[PDB]
Amino acid sequence: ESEYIKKHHRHELVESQCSSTLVKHIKAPLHLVWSIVRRFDEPQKYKPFISRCVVQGKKLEVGSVREVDLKSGLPATKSTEVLEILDDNEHILGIRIVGGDHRLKNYSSTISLHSETIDGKTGTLAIESFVVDVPEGNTKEETCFFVEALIQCNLNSLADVTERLQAESME
């Protein structure tokens, strides 16, 4: 489809890493979906397990760092994450988790957005990939299942939020 887009997505390089790719068809225009996805400073707009986010400054650029508050059901759990890719032409957002109160070490993700027509209606195809270390004591499957579940939830929420925003901008 695109070598350039492909190379920005994630893939396992060693046995102790896990990687997978999930897709979601969203019934909303790409410019609207990207307007939400690109906001590295406001993940909580659609990621259900993030309650708040702190970045320094307001201009998003490669190397921007955020600290997010995770809804883990425990006190004060955080994640520090760096913006690796912010491509406003090809609609690619890439992030790496640098640290936090996590099981997910060396986690990176890429989401890209692409216009798509389904049933004569133009919407957005979201493709999200990740790579992560498999923790000491874990099976690969345990880690992959967990991360795949999280991303599925995030994509389902992205679809719901943006589809609602689209409907609100028709009324």
3-class state of residue 135 by DSSP: coil
Q: CB-based contacts of 56: which residues, under 8 Å, 6+ apart? A: 65
Backbone angles phi, psi at 6, to 5 degrees: -50, -45
Binding site for abscisate: which residues? Answer: 47, 76-81, 103-109, 128
Cα–Cα distances in angstroms (integers) from residue 20 to residues 11, 45, 131, 133, 146, in the given order: 7, 24, 7, 12, 11
Do the Cβ atoms of 26 and 159 come closer than 8 Å? Answer: yes
Interatomic CA distance for residues 85 and 81, integer angstroms: 12
Q: Which of 103, 102, 61, 112 is nearest to 82 (CA)?
A: 61
Experimentally, how was this structure solved?
X-ray
Q: Resolution of this PDB entry, in A?
A: 1.5
Interatomic CA distance for residues 161 and 171, integer angstroms: 16
Interatomic CA distance for residues 155 and 10, integer angstroms: 17
Residue 72, domain CATH: 3.30.530.20
3-class state of residue 27 by DSSP: coil
Interatomic CA distance for residues 24 and 111, integer angstroms: 11
Number of domains in the chain: 1
Domain holding 88, by residue range, is 1-171
Binding site: which residues? Answer: 47, 76-81, 103-109, 128
